[model samples]
Target: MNINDLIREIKNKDYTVKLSGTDSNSITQLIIRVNNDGNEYVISESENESIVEKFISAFKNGWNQEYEDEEEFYNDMQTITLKSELN
Candidate 1:
C-alpha cells in the first residue's frame, strides 16, 4: 500500500492471498508488492524455496477447517496460480 512505510510493517504470518482487487491485497504489501496491489492475501512466500508448493501450504494453514482429505488438498492445490506462472 505504502512503499515509504514498508520498513515498519513487515510481518511474519503463515497466510495465502487470493487476488481480490486492491482492498484484499493490502495485508501483504509489506512483505512484497511494496510497489503495487492485488487481492485478498493471507498467503506466504519465501525466496530460494519452492513456494509453488509452499504456497499451497500457506493456503491450507490459514484455513479454519482442515482439508485432511488428501483429495481435497490437492484439488485446491491445482487451483493455485502464482504471478510467476503467468510469466
Candidate 2:
C-alpha cells in the first residue's frame, strides 16, 4: 500500500499522517517533505535524535478523521521515497 494510504488518520492536537513500511515502521508528523530528485539525496535524520543547532528558523506547516477513524486527505498525493516502499 502507498504510504499516503496508510495515513488513514492524522490528528494534529493540531494535523498528522502515517508513513509505514516493512515490520510496521511508520510515523506521523507536524511536518514532512517529498523531494523530487530524491535519488541523489543521502540526507538522513534519526527520529529519536536531532543534531540541529539553534541555526535557522525554517517556518512550517495535516491529515484526517474518518467514519472508522480518519479522513482521506492527500489529493493527487504522489511519492518516491527511495530504497523502500512507504507502506
lDDT of each: 0.35, 0.25
Deviation (Å) of 10 in candidate 1 = 23
In the range 8-53, model 2's lDDT, one tens digit per residue, is 3222112333343452343332233222223111122236521111
Q: Give a tens-digit lDDT track for model 1, residues 1-87.
A: 232222222232123323322533332222222112242333343354333445555554544343344344334443443323433
Each prediction's number of clashing residue pairs: 13, 5
Badly placed stretches (over 4 Å) of model 1 are: 1-43, 56-70, 82-84
Q: Model 1's lDDT to the true fold?
A: 0.35
TM-score top scorer: 1
Model 2 steric clash pairs? 12-15, 65-70, 65-71, 66-69, 66-70
TM-score of each model, in listed order: 0.27, 0.17
Rate residue 76 of model 1 by lDDT: 43
**Candidate no. 1 TM-score:** 0.27
